[PDB]
Motif scaffolding. Structure first.
Motif, PDB file in Angstrom:
ATOM      1  N   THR A 206       1.036   4.576   4.286  1.00  0.00           N
ATOM      2  CA  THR A 206       1.627   4.182   3.005  1.00  0.00           C
ATOM      3  C   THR A 206       2.784   5.068   2.630  1.00  0.00           C
ATOM      4  N   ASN A 207       3.702   4.560   1.819  1.00  0.00           N
ATOM      5  CA  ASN A 207       4.674   5.415   1.167  1.00  0.00           C
ATOM      6  C   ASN A 207       3.999   5.996  -0.066  1.00  0.00           C
TER       7      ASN A 207
ATOM      8  N   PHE B   3      -2.787  11.580 -10.565  1.00  0.00           N
ATOM      9  CA  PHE B   3      -2.187  12.765  -9.988  1.00  0.00           C
ATOM     10  C   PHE B   3      -1.056  13.262 -10.863  1.00  0.00           C
TER      11      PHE B   3
ATOM     12  N   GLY C 150      -0.662  11.937  -0.460  1.00  0.00           N
ATOM     13  CA  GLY C 150       0.750  12.115  -0.254  1.00  0.00           C
ATOM     14  C   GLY C 150       1.150  13.249   0.687  1.00  0.00           C
ATOM     15  N   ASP C 151       0.200  13.894   1.290  1.00  0.00           N
ATOM     16  CA  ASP C 151       0.457  14.835   2.396  1.00  0.00           C
ATOM     17  C   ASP C 151       0.360  14.110   3.731  1.00  0.00           C
TER      18      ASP C 151
ATOM     19  N   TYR D 150       0.245  10.672   3.905  1.00  0.00           N
ATOM     20  CA  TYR D 150       0.836   9.351   3.741  1.00  0.00           C
ATOM     21  C   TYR D 150      -0.123   8.275   4.258  1.00  0.00           C
TER      22      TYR D 150
ATOM     23  N   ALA E 175      -6.913  16.545  -1.620  1.00  0.00           N
ATOM     24  CA  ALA E 175      -5.609  15.970  -1.190  1.00  0.00           C
ATOM     25  C   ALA E 175      -5.542  14.461  -1.413  1.00  0.00           C
TER      26      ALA E 175
ATOM     27  N   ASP F 266       3.851  -1.990   2.668  1.00  0.00           N
ATOM     28  CA  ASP F 266       4.197  -3.338   3.007  1.00  0.00           C
ATOM     29  C   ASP F 266       2.928  -4.186   3.162  1.00  0.00           C
TER      30      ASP F 266
HETATM   31  C1  LIG Z   1       4.439  22.887  -5.857  1.00  0.00           C
HETATM   32  C2  LIG Z   1       3.803  21.689  -5.177  1.00  0.00           C
HETATM   33  O1  LIG Z   1       2.862  21.850  -4.425  1.00  0.00           O
HETATM   34  N1  LIG Z   1       4.294  20.469  -5.364  1.00  0.00           N
HETATM   35  C3  LIG Z   1       3.794  19.184  -4.856  1.00  0.00           C
HETATM   36  C4  LIG Z   1       4.510  18.700  -3.626  1.00  0.00           C
HETATM   37  O2  LIG Z   1       4.350  19.636  -2.556  1.00  0.00           O
HETATM   38  C5  LIG Z   1       3.905  17.324  -3.197  1.00  0.00           C
HETATM   39  O3  LIG Z   1       4.807  16.688  -2.307  1.00  0.00           O
HETATM   40  C6  LIG Z   1       4.490  16.804  -0.942  1.00  0.00           C
HETATM   41  O4  LIG Z   1       5.020  18.050  -0.429  1.00  0.00           O
HETATM   42  C7  LIG Z   1       4.764  18.221   0.944  1.00  0.00           C
HETATM   43  C8  LIG Z   1       5.198  19.656   1.336  1.00  0.00           C
HETATM   44  O5  LIG Z   1       6.554  19.809   0.885  1.00  0.00           O
HETATM   45  C9  LIG Z   1       5.586  17.185   1.703  1.00  0.00           C
HETATM   46  O6  LIG Z   1       5.238  17.331   3.081  1.00  0.00           O
HETATM   47  C10 LIG Z   1       6.367  17.225   3.937  1.00  0.00           C
HETATM   48  O7  LIG Z   1       6.802  15.877   4.039  1.00  0.00           O
HETATM   49  C11 LIG Z   1       7.945  15.684   4.855  1.00  0.00           C
HETATM   50  C12 LIG Z   1       8.391  14.239   4.715  1.00  0.00           C
HETATM   51  O8  LIG Z   1       7.364  13.381   5.230  1.00  0.00           O
HETATM   52  C13 LIG Z   1       7.970  12.100   5.486  1.00  0.00           C
HETATM   53  O9  LIG Z   1       8.717  12.118   6.722  1.00  0.00           O
HETATM   54  C14 LIG Z   1       7.875  12.523   7.825  1.00  0.00           C
HETATM   55  C15 LIG Z   1       8.680  12.567   9.110  1.00  0.00           C
HETATM   56  O10 LIG Z   1       9.553  11.442   9.150  1.00  0.00           O
HETATM   57  C16 LIG Z   1       6.710  11.555   7.999  1.00  0.00           C
HETATM   58  O11 LIG Z   1       5.757  11.973   8.970  1.00  0.00           O
HETATM   59  C17 LIG Z   1       5.905  11.436   6.724  1.00  0.00           C
HETATM   60  O12 LIG Z   1       4.877  10.431   6.911  1.00  0.00           O
HETATM   61  C18 LIG Z   1       6.855  11.070   5.623  1.00  0.00           C
HETATM   62  O13 LIG Z   1       7.459   9.825   5.937  1.00  0.00           O
HETATM   63  C19 LIG Z   1       6.922   8.734   5.152  1.00  0.00           C
HETATM   64  O14 LIG Z   1       5.868   8.144   5.899  1.00  0.00           O
HETATM   65  C20 LIG Z   1       5.290   6.999   5.232  1.00  0.00           C
HETATM   66  C21 LIG Z   1       4.135   6.528   6.101  1.00  0.00           C
HETATM   67  O15 LIG Z   1       4.605   6.197   7.423  1.00  0.00           O
HETATM   68  C22 LIG Z   1       6.345   5.952   5.016  1.00  0.00           C
HETATM   69  O16 LIG Z   1       5.693   4.878   4.364  1.00  0.00           O
HETATM   70  C23 LIG Z   1       6.149   3.555   4.665  1.00  0.00           C
HETATM   71  O17 LIG Z   1       7.223   3.221   3.810  1.00  0.00           O
HETATM   72  C24 LIG Z   1       7.734   1.917   4.080  1.00  0.00           C
HETATM   73  C25 LIG Z   1       9.012   1.735   3.267  1.00  0.00           C
HETATM   74  O18 LIG Z   1       9.857   2.878   3.512  1.00  0.00           O
HETATM   75  C26 LIG Z   1       6.688   0.822   3.791  1.00  0.00           C
HETATM   76  O19 LIG Z   1       6.385   0.806   2.389  1.00  0.00           O
HETATM   77  C27 LIG Z   1       5.476   1.154   4.664  1.00  0.00           C
HETATM   78  O20 LIG Z   1       4.392   0.209   4.486  1.00  0.00           O
HETATM   79  C28 LIG Z   1       5.015   2.567   4.398  1.00  0.00           C
HETATM   80  O21 LIG Z   1       3.930   2.868   5.264  1.00  0.00           O
HETATM   81  C29 LIG Z   1       7.489   6.509   4.184  1.00  0.00           C
HETATM   82  O22 LIG Z   1       8.548   5.557   4.108  1.00  0.00           O
HETATM   83  C30 LIG Z   1       8.040   7.761   4.853  1.00  0.00           C
HETATM   84  N2  LIG Z   1       9.066   8.352   4.000  1.00  0.00           N
HETATM   85  C31 LIG Z   1      10.193   8.889   4.498  1.00  0.00           C
HETATM   86  C32 LIG Z   1      11.136   9.463   3.476  1.00  0.00           C
HETATM   87  O23 LIG Z   1      10.424   8.909   5.704  1.00  0.00           O
HETATM   88  C33 LIG Z   1       7.590  16.080   6.293  1.00  0.00           C
HETATM   89  O24 LIG Z   1       8.784  15.951   7.077  1.00  0.00           O
HETATM   90  C34 LIG Z   1       7.053  17.521   6.339  1.00  0.00           C
HETATM   91  O25 LIG Z   1       6.526  17.777   7.659  1.00  0.00           O
HETATM   92  C35 LIG Z   1       6.977  19.033   8.198  1.00  0.00           C
HETATM   93  O26 LIG Z   1       6.395  20.182   7.568  1.00  0.00           O
HETATM   94  C36 LIG Z   1       4.957  20.238   7.748  1.00  0.00           C
HETATM   95  C37 LIG Z   1       4.399  21.457   7.015  1.00  0.00           C
HETATM   96  O27 LIG Z   1       4.987  21.575   5.706  1.00  0.00           O
HETATM   97  C38 LIG Z   1       4.532  20.238   9.228  1.00  0.00           C
HETATM   98  O28 LIG Z   1       3.108  20.149   9.342  1.00  0.00           O
HETATM   99  C39 LIG Z   1       5.144  19.039   9.947  1.00  0.00           C
HETATM  100  O29 LIG Z   1       4.928  19.080  11.365  1.00  0.00           O
HETATM  101  C40 LIG Z   1       6.634  19.038   9.687  1.00  0.00           C
HETATM  102  O30 LIG Z   1       7.114  20.264  10.245  1.00  0.00           O
HETATM  103  C41 LIG Z   1       8.432  20.088  10.769  1.00  0.00           C
HETATM  104  O31 LIG Z   1       8.341  19.688  12.135  1.00  0.00           O
HETATM  105  C42 LIG Z   1       9.609  19.327  12.684  1.00  0.00           C
HETATM  106  C43 LIG Z   1       9.437  18.774  14.103  1.00  0.00           C
HETATM  107  O32 LIG Z   1       8.068  18.452  14.409  1.00  0.00           O
HETATM  108  C44 LIG Z   1      10.502  20.573  12.634  1.00  0.00           C
HETATM  109  O33 LIG Z   1      11.792  20.278  13.181  1.00  0.00           O
HETATM  110  C45 LIG Z   1      10.630  21.085  11.191  1.00  0.00           C
HETATM  111  O34 LIG Z   1      11.447  22.264  11.118  1.00  0.00           O
HETATM  112  C46 LIG Z   1       9.243  21.367  10.623  1.00  0.00           C
HETATM  113  N3  LIG Z   1       9.320  21.766   9.222  1.00  0.00           N
HETATM  114  C47 LIG Z   1       8.440  22.580   8.616  1.00  0.00           C
HETATM  115  C48 LIG Z   1       8.723  22.829   7.160  1.00  0.00           C
HETATM  116  O35 LIG Z   1       7.469  23.076   9.176  1.00  0.00           O
HETATM  117  C49 LIG Z   1       5.940  17.726   5.320  1.00  0.00           C
HETATM  118  O36 LIG Z   1       4.763  17.024   5.773  1.00  0.00           O
HETATM  119  C50 LIG Z   1       5.187  15.764   1.223  1.00  0.00           C
HETATM  120  O37 LIG Z   1       6.081  14.802   1.775  1.00  0.00           O
HETATM  121  C51 LIG Z   1       5.242  15.666  -0.278  1.00  0.00           C
HETATM  122  N4  LIG Z   1       4.682  14.365  -0.637  1.00  0.00           N
HETATM  123  C52 LIG Z   1       5.298  13.499  -1.397  1.00  0.00           C
HETATM  124  C53 LIG Z   1       4.517  12.208  -1.652  1.00  0.00           C
HETATM  125  O38 LIG Z   1       6.390  13.621  -1.908  1.00  0.00           O
HETATM  126  C54 LIG Z   1       3.782  16.370  -4.407  1.00  0.00           C
HETATM  127  C55 LIG Z   1       2.964  15.145  -3.997  1.00  0.00           C
HETATM  128  O39 LIG Z   1       1.683  15.596  -3.666  1.00  0.00           O
HETATM  129  C56 LIG Z   1       1.077  14.859  -2.568  1.00  0.00           C
HETATM  130  O40 LIG Z   1       0.844  13.522  -3.015  1.00  0.00           O
HETATM  131  C57 LIG Z   1      -0.116  13.452  -4.084  1.00  0.00           C
HETATM  132  C58 LIG Z   1      -0.279  11.968  -4.450  1.00  0.00           C
HETATM  133  C59 LIG Z   1      -1.423  14.098  -3.728  1.00  0.00           C
HETATM  134  O41 LIG Z   1      -2.055  13.455  -2.614  1.00  0.00           O
HETATM  135  C60 LIG Z   1      -1.155  15.550  -3.341  1.00  0.00           C
HETATM  136  O42 LIG Z   1      -2.322  16.239  -3.042  1.00  0.00           O
HETATM  137  C61 LIG Z   1      -0.165  15.578  -2.187  1.00  0.00           C
HETATM  138  O43 LIG Z   1       0.151  16.976  -1.935  1.00  0.00           O
HETATM  139  O44 LIG Z   1       3.131  16.933  -5.514  1.00  0.00           O
HETATM  140  C62 LIG Z   1       3.792  18.140  -5.954  1.00  0.00           C
HETATM  141  N5  LIG Z   1       3.000  18.609  -7.083  1.00  0.00           N
HETATM  142  N6  LIG Z   1       3.189  17.925  -8.103  1.00  0.00           N
HETATM  143  N7  LIG Z   1       3.417  17.163  -9.130  1.00  0.00           N
END
Ligand SMILES: CC(=O)N[C@@H]1[C@@H](O)[C@H](O[C@@H]2O[C@H](CO)[C@@H](O[C@@H]3O[C@H](CO[C@H]4O[C@H](CO)[C@@H](O)[C@H](O)[C@@H]4O[C@@H]4O[C@H](CO)[C@@H](O[C@@H]5O[C@H](CO)[C@H](O)[C@H](O)[C@H]5O)[C@H](O)[C@H]4NC(C)=O)[C@@H](O)[C@H](O[C@H]4O[C@H](CO)[C@@H](O)[C@H](O)[C@@H]4O[C@@H]4O[C@H](CO)[C@@H](O)[C@H](O)[C@H]4NC(C)=O)[C@@H]3O)[C@H](O)[C@H]2NC(C)=O)[C@@H](CO[C@@H]2O[C@@H](C)[C@@H](O)[C@@H](O)[C@@H]2O)O[C@H]1N=[N+]=[N-]
Ligand SMILES: CC(=O)N[C@@H]1[C@@H](O)[C@H](O[C@@H]2O[C@H](CO)[C@@H](O[C@@H]3O[C@H](CO[C@H]4O[C@H](CO)[C@@H](O)[C@H](O)[C@@H]4O[C@@H]4O[C@H](CO)[C@@H](O[C@@H]5O[C@H](CO)[C@H](O)[C@H](O)[C@H]5O)[C@H](O)[C@H]4NC(C)=O)[C@@H](O)[C@H](O[C@H]4O[C@H](CO)[C@@H](O)[C@H](O)[C@@H]4O[C@@H]4O[C@H](CO)[C@@H](O)[C@H](O)[C@H]4NC(C)=O)[C@@H]3O)[C@H](O)[C@H]2NC(C)=O)[C@@H](CO[C@@H]2O[C@@H](C)[C@@H](O)[C@@H](O)[C@@H]2O)O[C@H]1N=[N+]=[N-]
Ligand SMILES: CC(=O)N[C@@H]1[C@@H](O)[C@H](O[C@@H]2O[C@H](CO)[C@@H](O[C@@H]3O[C@H](CO[C@H]4O[C@H](CO)[C@@H](O)[C@H](O)[C@@H]4O[C@@H]4O[C@H](CO)[C@@H](O[C@@H]5O[C@H](CO)[C@H](O)[C@H](O)[C@H]5O)[C@H](O)[C@H]4NC(C)=O)[C@@H](O)[C@H](O[C@H]4O[C@H](CO)[C@@H](O)[C@H](O)[C@@H]4O[C@@H]4O[C@H](CO)[C@@H](O)[C@H](O)[C@H]4NC(C)=O)[C@@H]3O)[C@H](O)[C@H]2NC(C)=O)[C@@H](CO[C@@H]2O[C@@H](C)[C@@H](O)[C@@H](O)[C@@H]2O)O[C@H]1N=[N+]=[N-]
Lengths: 40, 40, 40
Positions: free
Chosen positions: A35-36, C24, A13-14, A16, C2, C34
């Motif tokens: 994946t989502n 998890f 989930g980091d 995706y 991760a 999808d």
């Molecule tokens: C205390 C604790 O630790 N708690 C735990 C939580 O932390 C953890 O949750 C995770 O937390 C992460 C850190 O907060 C968080 O990361 C952030 O995510 C943001 C959102 O990411 C979405 O949008 C971005 C951009 O659009 C995409 O790239 C991502 O892929 C994602 O989009 C999703 O993508 C998938 C795949 O394409 C889509 O899937 C599709 O879905 C469709 C239907 O919709 C179909 O089904 C398809 O088939 C399917 O493929 C999703 O739809 C889509 N979802 C959405 C809503 O769009 C990122 O934006 C964010 O990135 C910024 O920050 C990082 C550093 O932090 C930088 O490296 C990045 O570059 C970026 O930086 C920014 O850069 C911009 C410009 O470049 C700048 O302007 C900004 O200012 C910058 N900001 C910063 C802050 O620097 C970052 O990556 C995770 O999202 C979050 N995960 C989840 C799942 O919620 C949870 C979960 O833990 C995770 O999952 C589990 C299962 C384990 O694996 C675990 O190890 C893992 O950590 O657990 C908490 N603990 N508990 N319980």
């Protein structure tokens, strides 16, 4: 067969991405797809 | 339930698809999705 | 790590999604993607 079995499946989930470890060749090939990930 | 269990999972690096055999109906339904495939 | 293990995998031909239950945290996180679904 061209399709090969998956031996282990994980998702991240980091990044995706889900990653499937495959039974093929030297054992170091994977399939990986976007994946989502969310909490229900 | 609308979601049904997967019984077997395979992936193919020629077609870049994974195929999940499903427990449903007559047994001949699959789910199939695009995937990357690579050597680590 | 991760990447986390999948405990159960299901697919749905009404929503065209597969859902992977993950080991998890509190147990309520899934991966979902999808997919095509068809009869062979
Ligand atoms: C205390 C604790 O630790 N708690 C735990 C939580 O932390 C953890 O949750 C995770 O937390 C992460 C850190 O907060 C968080 O990361 C952030 O995510 C943001 C959102 O990411 C979405 O949008 C971005 C951009 O659009 C995409 O790239 C991502 O892929 C994602 O989009 C999703 O993508 C998938 C795949 O394409 C889509 O899937 C599709 O879905 C469709 C239907 O919709 C179909 O089904 C398809 O088939 C399917 O493929 C999703 O739809 C889509 N979802 C959405 C809503 O769009 C990122 O934006 C964010 O990135 C910024 O920050 C990082 C550093 O932090 C930088 O490296 C990045 O570059 C970026 O930086 C920014 O850069 C911009 C410009 O470049 C700048 O302007 C900004 O200012 C910058 N900001 C910063 C802050 O620097 C970052 O990556 C995770 O999202 C979050 N995960 C989840 C799942 O919620 C949870 C979960 O833990 C995770 O999952 C589990 C299962 C384990 O694996 C675990 O190890 C893992 O950590 O657990 C908490 N603990 N508990 N319980
Ligand atoms: C000795 C031996 O046999 N060794 C083994 C290797 O052979 C074998 O590796 C396979 O080898 C195949 C033959 O060389 C090779 O096939 C070629 O692949 C080329 C590249 O394909 C990529 O690009 C094309 C076009 O863009 C796409 O269509 C493909 O799908 C693929 O793109 C990838 O697509 C996936 C899915 O969409 C993407 O995934 C997404 O990724 C994102 C992140 O990036 C997210 O995660 C998403 O969720 C996810 O879905 C990938 O990202 C993406 N990757 C890239 C880099 O883009 C093809 O171009 C090539 O096609 C040409 O040639 C064939 C015939 O050979 C023709 O039928 C085609 O029409 C085409 O012909 C050309 O046509 C054009 C115009 O139409 C013309 O101009 C050209 O001149 C024509 N050229 C020719 C030559 O005719 C061809 O298909 C495989 O790629 C290669 N596989 C891998 C994985 O490396 C390896 C691996 O074995 C395979 O995998 C294992 C697991 C088993 O299943 C096994 O059975 C299978 O063979 O094993 C070696 N042995 N060992 N060890
Ligand atoms: C007696 C009995 O019950 N028999 C069982 C069958 O019923 C059952 O089959 C299911 O039947 C459903 C009802 O008939 C049927 O639902 C309809 O599906 C139509 C087609 O859906 C495709 O197109 C639409 C729109 O483009 C998409 O949204 C869909 O996602 C789907 O497209 C597909 O999408 C996936 C994912 O993106 C793609 O996958 C990708 O594929 C590529 C390669 O191609 C790569 O691999 C990728 O990686 C991969 O992700 C597929 O490619 C793609 N396929 C195609 C062909 O495009 C819907 O159009 C239709 O929706 C309308 O109707 C519903 C209500 O009925 C409304 O809620 C909707 O809003 C919509 O309404 C219309 O709205 C428009 C404008 O908004 C309006 O103009 C219209 O007039 C409105 N019409 C109406 C009628 O209201 C509807 O959802 C299912 O498709 C069908 N499923 C299958 C698999 O065939 C079978 C199967 O059972 C199912 O599967 C099993 C495994 C179990 O889970 C089971 O529980 C489940 O039911 O079983 C029969 N029983 N038996 N044996």
């Amino acid at each position: 067969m061209a399709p090969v079995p998956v031996t282990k499946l994980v998702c991240d989930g980091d990044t995706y991405k889900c990653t499937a470890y495959l039974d093929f060749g030297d054992g170091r090939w994977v399939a990986q797809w976007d994946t989502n990930v969310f909490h229900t």
